Design an enzyme around this catalytic site. Structure first.
Site, mmCIF file in Angstrom:
data_model
loop_
_atom_site.group_PDB
_atom_site.id
_atom_site.type_symbol
_atom_site.label_atom_id
_atom_site.label_comp_id
_atom_site.label_asym_id
_atom_site.label_seq_id
_atom_site.Cartn_x
_atom_site.Cartn_y
_atom_site.Cartn_z
ATOM 1 N N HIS A 106 -20.606 11.570 3.232
ATOM 2 C CA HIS A 106 -21.651 11.947 3.793
ATOM 3 C C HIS A 106 -22.944 10.919 3.756
ATOM 4 C CE1 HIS A 106 -19.361 16.025 3.269
ATOM 5 N NE2 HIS A 106 -19.610 15.809 4.378
ATOM 6 N N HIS A 154 -10.797 14.672 11.105
ATOM 7 C CA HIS A 154 -10.715 16.221 10.938
ATOM 8 C C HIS A 154 -9.528 16.766 11.995
ATOM 9 C CE1 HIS A 154 -14.325 16.148 8.699
ATOM 10 N NE2 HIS A 154 -14.783 17.178 9.285
ATOM 11 N N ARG A 160 0.782 -1.370 -0.145
ATOM 12 C CA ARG A 160 -0.096 -0.177 0.098
ATOM 13 C C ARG A 160 0.987 1.129 -0.109
ATOM 14 N NH1 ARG A 160 -4.613 -1.321 -2.164
ATOM 15 N NH2 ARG A 160 -5.911 -2.650 -0.622
ATOM 16 N N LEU A 210 -11.961 12.096 -1.348
ATOM 17 C CA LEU A 210 -12.447 10.716 -1.027
ATOM 18 C C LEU A 210 -12.964 10.421 0.262
ATOM 19 C CD1 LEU A 210 -10.829 8.135 0.607
ATOM 20 C CD2 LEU A 210 -9.159 8.599 -1.142
ATOM 21 N N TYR A 211 -12.756 11.104 1.225
ATOM 22 C CA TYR A 211 -13.215 11.025 2.755
ATOM 23 C C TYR A 211 -14.597 11.732 2.960
ATOM 24 C CZ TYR A 211 -11.090 8.216 6.422
ATOM 25 O OH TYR A 211 -10.768 7.282 7.283
ATOM 26 N N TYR A 223 -12.394 -7.681 6.012
ATOM 27 C CA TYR A 223 -11.612 -8.923 5.975
ATOM 28 C C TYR A 223 -11.714 -9.677 7.128
ATOM 29 C CZ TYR A 223 -9.152 -5.858 2.417
ATOM 30 O OH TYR A 223 -9.008 -4.732 1.343
ATOM 31 N N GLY A 264 -8.096 5.104 -1.066
ATOM 32 C CA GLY A 264 -8.069 5.105 0.352
ATOM 33 C C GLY A 264 -6.950 4.463 1.091
ATOM 34 N N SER A 276 -4.348 6.278 3.645
ATOM 35 C CA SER A 276 -4.717 5.755 5.247
ATOM 36 C C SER A 276 -3.434 5.176 5.789
ATOM 37 C CB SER A 276 -5.769 4.958 5.060
ATOM 38 O OG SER A 276 -5.977 4.551 6.411
HETATM 39 C C1 HEM Z 1 -22.549 14.835 11.041
HETATM 40 C C2 HEM Z 1 -22.876 15.618 10.175
HETATM 41 C C3 HEM Z 1 -22.040 16.553 9.276
HETATM 42 C C4 HEM Z 1 -22.122 17.752 8.818
HETATM 43 C C5 HEM Z 1 -23.487 18.685 9.166
HETATM 44 C C6 HEM Z 1 -21.046 17.965 7.782
HETATM 45 C C7 HEM Z 1 -21.016 19.289 7.081
HETATM 46 C C8 HEM Z 1 -19.554 19.486 6.584
HETATM 47 C C9 HEM Z 1 -19.375 20.682 6.306
HETATM 48 C C10 HEM Z 1 -20.481 22.077 6.005
HETATM 49 C C11 HEM Z 1 -18.259 20.830 5.543
HETATM 50 C C12 HEM Z 1 -17.539 22.043 4.807
HETATM 51 C C13 HEM Z 1 -17.687 21.895 3.245
HETATM 52 C C14 HEM Z 1 -16.896 22.916 2.557
HETATM 53 O O1 HEM Z 1 -15.941 23.056 2.665
HETATM 54 O O2 HEM Z 1 -17.720 23.601 1.859
HETATM 55 C C15 HEM Z 1 -17.702 19.414 5.590
HETATM 56 C C16 HEM Z 1 -16.515 18.955 5.117
HETATM 57 C C17 HEM Z 1 -16.124 17.582 5.242
HETATM 58 N N1 HEM Z 1 -16.654 16.584 5.806
HETATM 59 FE FE1 HEM Z 1 -18.667 16.579 6.961
HETATM 60 N N2 HEM Z 1 -20.300 16.797 7.745
HETATM 61 C C18 HEM Z 1 -20.880 15.880 8.574
HETATM 62 C C19 HEM Z 1 -20.339 14.624 8.703
HETATM 63 C C20 HEM Z 1 -19.148 14.017 8.161
HETATM 64 C C21 HEM Z 1 -18.889 12.677 8.070
HETATM 65 C C22 HEM Z 1 -19.638 11.503 8.906
HETATM 66 C C23 HEM Z 1 -17.731 12.408 7.514
HETATM 67 C C24 HEM Z 1 -17.023 11.247 7.296
HETATM 68 C C25 HEM Z 1 -15.567 11.233 7.404
HETATM 69 C C26 HEM Z 1 -17.552 13.990 7.013
HETATM 70 C C27 HEM Z 1 -16.356 14.246 6.130
HETATM 71 C C28 HEM Z 1 -15.871 15.370 5.709
HETATM 72 C C29 HEM Z 1 -14.577 15.744 5.214
HETATM 73 C C30 HEM Z 1 -13.335 15.008 5.002
HETATM 74 C C31 HEM Z 1 -14.649 17.351 5.160
HETATM 75 C C32 HEM Z 1 -13.551 18.285 4.378
HETATM 76 C C33 HEM Z 1 -12.930 18.845 5.757
HETATM 77 C C34 HEM Z 1 -11.974 19.822 5.224
HETATM 78 O O3 HEM Z 1 -11.453 19.852 4.258
HETATM 79 O O4 HEM Z 1 -11.783 20.892 6.142
HETATM 80 N N3 HEM Z 1 -18.228 14.753 7.362
HETATM 81 N N4 HEM Z 1 -18.452 18.498 6.164
HETATM 82 C C1 LIG Z 2 -3.962 -13.470 0.485
HETATM 83 C C2 LIG Z 2 -3.947 -12.018 0.846
HETATM 84 C C3 LIG Z 2 -2.851 -11.259 0.905
HETATM 85 C C4 LIG Z 2 -2.919 -9.780 1.344
HETATM 86 C C5 LIG Z 2 -2.450 -8.806 0.463
HETATM 87 C C6 LIG Z 2 -3.669 -7.828 0.085
HETATM 88 C C7 LIG Z 2 -3.374 -6.630 0.614
HETATM 89 C C8 LIG Z 2 -3.855 -5.379 -0.620
HETATM 90 O O1 LIG Z 2 -2.563 -5.671 -1.658
HETATM 91 C C9 LIG Z 2 -3.038 -4.931 -2.815
HETATM 92 O O2 LIG Z 2 -3.623 -5.382 -4.061
HETATM 93 C C10 LIG Z 2 -3.598 -5.066 -5.305
HETATM 94 C C11 LIG Z 2 -3.895 -5.956 -6.294
HETATM 95 O O3 LIG Z 2 -3.070 -6.943 -6.335
HETATM 96 C C12 LIG Z 2 -2.333 -3.968 -5.329
HETATM 97 O O4 LIG Z 2 -2.660 -3.214 -6.543
HETATM 98 C C13 LIG Z 2 -2.084 -3.222 -4.202
HETATM 99 O O5 LIG Z 2 -0.763 -2.436 -4.795
HETATM 100 C C14 LIG Z 2 -1.831 -4.050 -3.073
HETATM 101 O O6 LIG Z 2 -1.299 -3.138 -2.070
HETATM 102 C C1 LIG Z 3 -9.992 5.613 3.760
HETATM 103 O O1 LIG Z 3 -10.686 4.573 3.165
HETATM 104 C C2 LIG Z 3 -10.291 3.418 3.392
HETATM 105 C C3 LIG Z 3 -10.821 2.277 2.605
HETATM 106 C C4 LIG Z 3 -10.350 0.932 2.634
HETATM 107 C C5 LIG Z 3 -9.186 0.567 3.466
HETATM 108 C C6 LIG Z 3 -8.942 -0.523 3.348
HETATM 109 C C7 LIG Z 3 -7.778 -1.235 3.980
HETATM 110 C C8 LIG Z 3 -7.253 -2.523 3.950
HETATM 111 C C9 LIG Z 3 -6.498 -2.997 5.228
HETATM 112 C C10 LIG Z 3 -6.405 -2.704 2.794
HETATM 113 O O2 LIG Z 3 -6.910 -3.444 1.786
HETATM 114 O O3 LIG Z 3 -5.207 -1.936 2.773
HETATM 115 C C11 LIG Z 3 -6.795 -0.040 4.693
HETATM 116 C C12 LIG Z 3 -7.336 1.220 4.581
HETATM 117 C C13 LIG Z 3 -8.504 1.441 4.066
HETATM 118 C C14 LIG Z 3 -9.004 2.830 3.971
HETATM 119 CL CL LIG Z 4 -7.841 6.957 7.595
#
Ligand code: HEM
Ligand SMILES: CCCCCCCCO[C@@H]1O[C@H](CO)[C@@H](O)[C@H](O)[C@H]1O
Ligand SMILES: COc1ccc2cc([C@H](C)C(=O)O)ccc2c1
Ligand SMILES: [Cl-]
Ligand code: HEM
Ligand SMILES: *[C@@H]1O[C@H](CO)[C@@H](O[C@@H]2O[C@H](CO)[C@@H](O)[C@H](O)[C@H]2NC(C)=O)[C@H](O)[C@H]1NC(C)=O
Ligand SMILES: *[C@@H]1O[C@H](CO)[C@@H](O[C@@H]2O[C@H](CO)[C@@H](O)[C@H](O)[C@H]2NC(C)=O)[C@H](O)[C@H]1NC(C)=O
Ligand SMILES: CCCCCCCCO[C@@H]1O[C@H](CO)[C@@H](O)[C@H](O)[C@H]1O
Ligand SMILES: CCCCCCCCO[C@@H]1O[C@H](CO)[C@@H](O)[C@H](O)[C@H]1O
Ligand SMILES: CCCCCCCCO[C@@H]1O[C@H](CO)[C@@H](O)[C@H](O)[C@H]1O
Ligand SMILES: COc1ccc2cc([C@H](C)C(=O)O)ccc2c1
Ligand SMILES: *[C@@H]1O[C@H](CO)[C@@H](O)[C@H](O)[C@H]1NC(C)=O
Ligand SMILES: *[C@@H]1O[C@H](CO)[C@@H](O)[C@H](O)[C@H]1NC(C)=O
Ligand SMILES: *[C@@H]1O[C@H](CO)[C@@H](O)[C@H](O)[C@H]1NC(C)=O
Ligand SMILES: *[C@H]1O[C@H](CO)[C@@H](O)[C@H](O)[C@H]1NC(C)=O
Ligand SMILES: [Cl-]
Lengths: 552, 552
Positions: free
Chosen positions: A357, A176, A89, A353-354, A324, A495, A499
């Site tokens: 919503h 966050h 990864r 990607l994260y 898994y 992802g 991650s």
């Molecule tokens: C609980 C209710 C939630 C509300 C009301 C909410 C609302 C928002 C708002 C208003 C923004 C700002 C978007 C912009 O820049 O215009 C945002 C950003 C974002 N949200 Fe949520 N959200 C919620 C839950 C979640 C959840 C569950 C996730 C899952 C991981 C998530 C992931 C994100 C991420 C990654 C950003 C970008 C943050 C940044 O770049 O600063 N949110 N959200």
């Molecule tokens: C039998 C399971 C072995 C665990 C290794 C799998 C963990 C994720 O392995 C992923 O597989 C993809 C396809 O082969 C590749 O493109 C990624 O580079 C690799 O990280």
């Molecule tokens: C942020 O979103 C993800 C999604 C899937 C994931 C899968 C895995 C497993 C352990 C993998 O296949 O590597 C790890 C992290 C991940 C982050």
């Molecule tokens: Cl993560």
């Protein structure tokens, strides 16, 4: 007019202009050669023959449960497999980092300026004839149309993997600390200069904020007691700036590391749990080290909480979302005989990607109440009314929404979903299929292949025309899920690299840090190596309610 | 007070208090075990037995010239040996970094706060009974007395390795990009947040300064032309802050990346040469890329100059000061199959050891003039009067002073040398012998062993009493030199790890950067891989005068 506008170089070859209308691909260390880095070296041909697809590997990891039960109890084999997961990864991530929103070529500015998110793929140049480079129409389709046709929720689609609200709010809280967009500067800029798991969302981004949050006795963070329960202190008491609407009274303006965490009670639930955990670890360390002062107690507790966080993220959170049967392991020692860079820069595409919503429900169900979005937002009185025990019991039982598979973004957050599309475009993101190639995935050849279905696929074809102009963000949310899974292939294969690299790249995972003495001795070290989402809740929530990231 | 005050843990084991008057050593991955990490494991015993001393290795590298001449012309063997030099040296540096002036235990503050210099050894705790821990008298000897008795120059002692003023001023110019002490905060703090070879001393530490120095045409830096010769632009023209006495004429207030470089004409000589080199590279890249804009020209030229600097530092500068018959190589590819961290944090002790003030002559001899320190300081008129060609010719011929061997610091800079001692103490540096152990050297058993003579040794014994309380900085300057060498053992064995790690840790040395496209193609890449001090001067100084780091 940039001759690199068509993204001609394949297999991670680098495009450079050599004149107004000519380019050159640099195929160094790609395993390929030729004009566009598409002619494979002999050993590359062998590797491509043997390499299984992500869908094949996913199948193997989510079947044969009896065989995995055996493998999970052979430490040598569990270590070997986890090692390969981490290394395979992490190799997909450029480290040290390269591009950003303003630099499609490597530069000292892009390397050194920590205020930028990095970029897994460089931006499409400003002078390219189309948004995606040369393919597609002069304008991408109306983002309102994309949103309304294939993203907005009709009926709630529950997650077949059984993800719950503990999972949804953990995702939001955890991520966050490193997604903190600097809206003053633009979507390509971050306020999280640590670029990873530093727990700034508990302790504050800056030293002055940290010091305002600290008690300066026994290593502890400031807190208040309301009806016998420990909560974060107030803005008034601490002078810590937070975002709250004017109607929130002084007593409900809780102050925590991350200024936005007053947004929803689910975030404040985790903020409270982690605050309690910090002060708990302080008590443990003081018992072990009566000779230590406040500063060392504080700093050592922070390092322990960083460790606990990474432990829980891998062995509970990622374990759950992966689906898994293989038992993942947090073990920094697995990388000590491997080439690996203990550093990380947060990618804009990882942020994009994260935006999960669709996880959000139509209403937030606590005890016998069903709160609307309007009732739930900026309403810490809900947390005080029900208490953490009831929050945990309720969130553990409430199912989250499916993220892939289309049409599951709650209408309450439609503007946020639209913003994700619009901001990707502002930041000149390359297409879904360019990102697929970047992470060793086969380009989709049709919209039906993408969705696994006819209706949304036809809507998208009418909007985009060419599958090679389809956008990353909407594609992640409409993608054909894996069987009974929360995500499709593109989400997992992008992802996972971002991650795992972010988690293992932390300096506490480096050999000079990963020692008992770093964490105040074996007792401190054991807090990390035995941490779980259940233990975090058990120790810090009255009654030790059962919890998990899966509904029962 | 602190039970770790005696530095009980050996072989890089870490000391942690376990109570008010008890400690534990963490011997993890040291190769030793037992209460103080002094019992070797079997493999460690064997490695210890076979390992040659630094003095033996130095002997071999500085003799058998005929054998080395063969070795140098066998690429596989040259690569093998240089690879081992890089890896063995870098192994001595903690990366990610650990301690600093305020933290004798690992902490997120020490890791994350880039305003600190890092520390190879943690500071002596504040509550320890003596400056060095538990050994020695309550106070260290009078620093003025140490200075006058064993450091100050009586008669000028020339360097037997033949180092010249081109070498001396190169060291000063080059190192002052990463030694930039933030005196407002204290000696343990730096303004060089890049922590390495970023060429901020040419381009400015901040974007605001860089933009004031730039022409914004063809990637170039601003300049003025005086008597037909290119010099840096003025403070008045650029608005960039520089340190100058208020009486310096307007046109002689040259503005360059590093605000202190008006201090001496020797620094301004190199600043002018590098300025010209940047603009020369811009011309080359513009010819190769007529399609490129000012920003890409600027950024790509900067990356090329970073590469040129590292190339010259290893293959000319380090080559000279090493005295080795082995031909060192700048080749990032040597590390691609090795474990190596592409990052660096500048160590306080590296700063301290690099205070090579004995290099400085009694007078600065240019053409037929012999300038005193008083006449040379803040006097750019000297540079304008003689010109770069004459500066190069004169400084190539003028011999520099010996650094080790004692009594060779010119009195003109006595206050700076005294400050080096006083600030080491303020920063609670451990002793010479603790630092020797830290870098795998045998502790000195007497002052006569340190100096290799009687007189200075006797004065030192009367001042310090115990060899185990001798201080690092004065020791480096009084140490017995290697035979006809500029330095003794401690300078090389500490300096080399810090130096080589800082050079190879640069991101341009990482596999994703080390390719032609990063530098605008093969033409740019060639500029780096063929760079030399002679070619730097030949390309940018009228008449292409001969130059070298050694007197002829
Ligand atoms: C609980 C209710 C939630 C509300 C009301 C909410 C609302 C928002 C708002 C208003 C923004 C700002 C978007 C912009 O820049 O215009 C945002 C950003 C974002 N949200 Fe949520 N959200 C919620 C839950 C979640 C959840 C569950 C996730 C899952 C991981 C998530 C992931 C994100 C991420 C990654 C950003 C970008 C943050 C940044 O770049 O600063 N949110 N959200
Ligand atoms: C039998 C399971 C072995 C665990 C290794 C799998 C963990 C994720 O392995 C992923 O597989 C993809 C396809 O082969 C590749 O493109 C990624 O580079 C690799 O990280
Ligand atoms: C942020 O979103 C993800 C999604 C899937 C994931 C899968 C895995 C497993 C352990 C993998 O296949 O590597 C790890 C992290 C991940 C982050
Ligand atoms: Cl993560
Ligand atoms: C040419 C005449 C020189 C003069 C007048 C001079 C003077 C000074 C002064 C005044 C300081 C600041 C001391 C303080 O504020 O504590 C300093 C620092 C320093 N000098 Fe020199 N010096 C000279 C040459 C050199 C040379 C040849 C070297 C060789 C490497 C050198 C290495 C250093 C280093 C490493 C520092 C510390 C820089 C920092 O931490 O900011 N100096 N010098
Ligand atoms: C990192 O890059 C950003 C973007 O260029 C810099 O922010 C700009 O700085 C300039 C020069 O000081 C200002 O004029 C702009 O107003 C800033 N904002 C922009 C353009 O968004 C930032 O200074 C850089 N950070 C560092 C540490 O150099
Ligand atoms: C890095 O550490 C230094 C030293 O602690 C910080 O500077 C201090 O900041 C505090 C809080 O603002 C002030 O009270 C002190 O006056 C400062 N001390 C010194 C010696 O300057 C600095 O803020 C830290 N840098 C970062 C980025 O957190
Ligand atoms: C004949 C010598 C060729 C190999 C070059 C070695 C470069 C210096 O090697 C050094 O030698 C020291 C003493 O053994 C060790 O303590 C250091 O760890 C090592 O880096
Ligand atoms: C294969 C050839 C091996 C010969 C190695 C010669 C070793 C010289 O070792 C000696 O060690 C002393 C250590 O204090 C130094 O003082 C001397 O200068 C040095 O010559
Ligand atoms: C340039 C010298 C300035 C300081 C000299 C006065 C400090 C006395 O120091 C003495 O100097 C004598 C003469 O070199 C030596 O013989 C003695 O060993 C030394 O202790
Ligand atoms: C800063 O001071 C030094 C001194 C000696 C050095 C020697 C060497 C050689 C190549 C070595 O033995 O490693 C490198 C760097 C050095 C820096
Ligand atoms: C390289 O790619 C271009 C378009 O991207 C294509 O026209 C050309 O045929 C390719 N060259 C080779 C030799 O495959
Ligand atoms: C906040 O939550 C409370 C319950 O704790 C609820 O009664 C109230 O209506 C909410 N506030 C708003 C503005 O909806
Ligand atoms: C500076 O240098 C000039 C020669 O260029 C010399 O004549 C003069 O004395 C110097 N100035 C000072 C203040 O010493
Ligand atoms: C280290 O422990 C040893 C036991 O081997 C003990 O004898 C010694 O006193 C300790 N260190 C010091 C400071 O002497
Ligand atoms: Cl160096």
């Amino acid at each position: 007019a940039n001759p690199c506008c068509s993204n001609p170089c394949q297999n991670r070859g680098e495009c450079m202009s050599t004149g107004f209308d000519q380019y050159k691909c640099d195929c160094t260390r790609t395993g390929f050669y030729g004009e566009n880095c598409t002619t494979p070296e002999f050993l590359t041909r062998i590797k491509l023959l043997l390499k299984p697809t992500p869908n094949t590997v996913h199948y193997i990891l989510t079947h044969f449960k009896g065989v995995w039960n055996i493998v999970n109890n052979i430490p040598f084999l569990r270590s070997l497999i986890m090692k390969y997961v981490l290394t395979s990864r992490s190799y997909l991530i450029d480290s040290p980092p390269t591009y950003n929103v303003h630099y499609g070529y490597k530069s000292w500015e892009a390397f050194s300026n920590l205020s930028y998110y990095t970029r897994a793929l460089p931006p499409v140049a400003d002078d390219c004839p189309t948004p995606m480079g040369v393919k597609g129409n002069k304008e991408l389709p109306d983002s309102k149309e994309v949103l309304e046709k294939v993203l907005l929720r009709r009926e709630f689609i529950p997650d077949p993997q059984g993800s719950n609200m503990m999972f949804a709010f953990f995702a939001q809280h955890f991520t966050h600390q490193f997604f903190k967009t600097d809206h003053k500067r633009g979507p390509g800029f971050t306020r999280g200069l640590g670029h990873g798991v530093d727990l700034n969302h508990i302790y504050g981004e800056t030293l002055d904020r940290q010091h305002k949050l600290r008690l300066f006795k026994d290593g502890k963070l400031k807190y208040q007691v309301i009806g016998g329960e420990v909560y974060p202190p107030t803005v008034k008491d601490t002078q810590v700036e937070m975002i709250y609407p004017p109607h929130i009274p002084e007593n409900l303006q809780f102050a925590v590391g991350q200024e936005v965490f007053g947004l929803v009670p689910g975030l404040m639930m985790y903020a409270t749990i982690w605050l309690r955990e910090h002060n708990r670890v302080c008590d443990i360390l003081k018992q072990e080290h009566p000779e230590w002062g406040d500063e060392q107690l504080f700093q050592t507790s922070r390092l322990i909480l960083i460790g606990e966080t990474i432990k829980i993220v891998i062995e509970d959170y990622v374990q759950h979302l992966s689906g898994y049967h293989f038992k993942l392991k947090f073990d920094p020692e697995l990388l000590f005989n491997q080439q690996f860079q203990y550093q990380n820069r947060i990618a804009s595409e990882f942020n994009t990607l994260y935006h999960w919503h669709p996880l959000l429900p139509d209403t937030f169900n606590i005890e016998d109440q069903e709160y609307s979005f309007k009732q739930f937002l900026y309403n810490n009185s809900i947390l005080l009314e029900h208490g953490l025990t009831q929050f945990v019991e309720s969130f553990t039982r409430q199912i989250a929404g499916r993220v892939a598979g289309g049409r599951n973004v709650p209408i309450a957050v439609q503007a946020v979903a639209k913003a994700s599309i619009d901001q990707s475009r502002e930041m000149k993101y390359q297409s879904l299929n360019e990102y697929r190639k970047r992470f060793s995935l086969k380009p989709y050849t049709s919209f039906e292949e993408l969705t696994g279905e006819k209706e949304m696929a036809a809507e998208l074809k009418a909007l985009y025309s060419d599958i090679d102009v389809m956008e990353l963000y909407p594609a992640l949310l409409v993608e054909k899920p894996r069987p009974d899974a929360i995500f499709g292939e593109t989400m997992v294969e992008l992802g996972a690299p971002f991650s795992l690299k972010g988690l293992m790249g932390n300096p506490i995972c480096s050999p000079q840090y990963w020692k008992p003495s770093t964490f105040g001795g074996e007792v401190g070290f054991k807090i990390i190596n035995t941490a779980s989402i259940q233990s975090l809740i058990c120790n810090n929530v009255k009654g030790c309610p059962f919890t998990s990231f899966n509904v029962q």
